[model samples]
Target: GSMSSKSPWANPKKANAFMKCLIQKISVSPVFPQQEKEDMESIVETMMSAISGVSTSRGSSEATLQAMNMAFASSMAELVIAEDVNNPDSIAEKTEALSQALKQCFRSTMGTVNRQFITEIKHLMTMFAAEAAQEAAAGDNE
Candidate 1:
């Protein structure tokens, strides 16, 4: 089937597509500024680097994943505060749908990737959720 014996992290093309799709879906905003667009591109590059780290490094995979998660969290917080994307009322549902889509993409590729990495991925989503809420609150004050 579609599942491979190789790790999904081992597949650069699939991983890059996944990242690009995520950035497009989550970071695109109606009133997104040029600077913020650049920032999102940089964040996408950082994510690619982190995924590259996983693909190339024979050791310290967990460490790289952790770093990637932190980068993702930071980028997500910035995205939340930067502009208006979709309806505010839909964030909760949108986030859940996007998250589930991410998981299925990996599931289709590797069937079962590393448990720790999966956990880290889930944690990354949690980070975004927390940061998004915090950023929204901060925006409300401004």
Candidate 2:
């Protein structure tokens, strides 16, 4: 319990509410689509699980966020399959941009001077795009 204050991530309740509300607002906005609200909540829940595992170790938070990014990327892949939003290459890079942009928008106190995590998503984005590409190719064979 006491370890949370020292961690790079936020407390679970705060983090959940922040992501759920912010992401939901973004999901339903004209920039994306209203139909995605259901999907976005699913995405947020993945991150919700990612954040809940932090402990007292120094590497734990960083490791958690990286896993979070990976999980988020996997979740993105699901949406890519389900809604088929943003073709493989297009969406990953775009979300890579938005990942950084969204950073500025949310001032929620994850921590002061935390390492920039925007890069983490981009790393996954490349993999995700390629993965999505394969899925797309695979589907055409179906």
Candidate 3:
């Protein structure tokens, strides 16, 4: 018997929507600087590659996805925040936009009964939220 169903991440249409939404949301943010079309495209490529790597791996577990989530989030943050390093406000704003973009991405694409994967997504988001708060507090102290 062949497995007829596909992984949610394997759909090109949904992936395109997620990428479009991310670019649209981030581009409009005051904190994000002007991005070349090529640059943005490259970012999407990197993200997709990362996602594909995780999705195709053997034994996808909550822990594995959580680590993958952190790596993904870090990649996004590194690109978005590197340009505005001097301004803590800009970092904060970009981080928020990044967070929103990820949440939207998951919401738009991750509609399935994979409770473990979904939980991992939530845990990833929670981890990001906590790190963002800690960064905020550290900024306040400075």
lDDT of 3 by residue, 31-124 (tens): 5556544576776777667666666543455654455546555555455344434456665665566666666665665533344543564465
Q: Candidate 2, after superposition: displacement of residue 27 in Å?
A: 2.7
- What TM-score, to 2 decimals, does candidate 2 have? 0.56
Residue 45, model 3: Cα distance from true site in angstroms: 3.9
> In model 1, which runs have C-alpha deviations exceeding 4 angstroms?
1-14, 24-39, 49-61, 81-88, 113-142
C-alpha lDDT score of every prediction, in listed order: 0.57, 0.53, 0.57
How do all models score by TM-score? 0.50, 0.56, 0.47
Ranked by lDDT from best down, the candidates are 3, 1, 2
* Model 3 misplaced stretches (Cα beyond 4 Å): 1-12, 36-38, 46-71, 80-84, 111-142
lDDT of 1 by residue, 1-142 (tens): 4444653434456556656666665455433345666777887877767666666645446566446556665566455433323345454554565566556655654555445654665566556656766776777775
Pairs of residues at least 3 apart in sequence or in different chains that clash in candidate 2: none
Question: Candidate 1's error at 64, in angstroms?
Answer: 1.7
Could you report the Cα RMSD, in angstroms, for every candidate shown?
Answer: 5.5, 6.3, 6.9
For residues 35-124, write the lDDT of model 2, one tens digit per residue: 666767766765654454455333345566556656665665565454333454545544644565456434444433333444554556
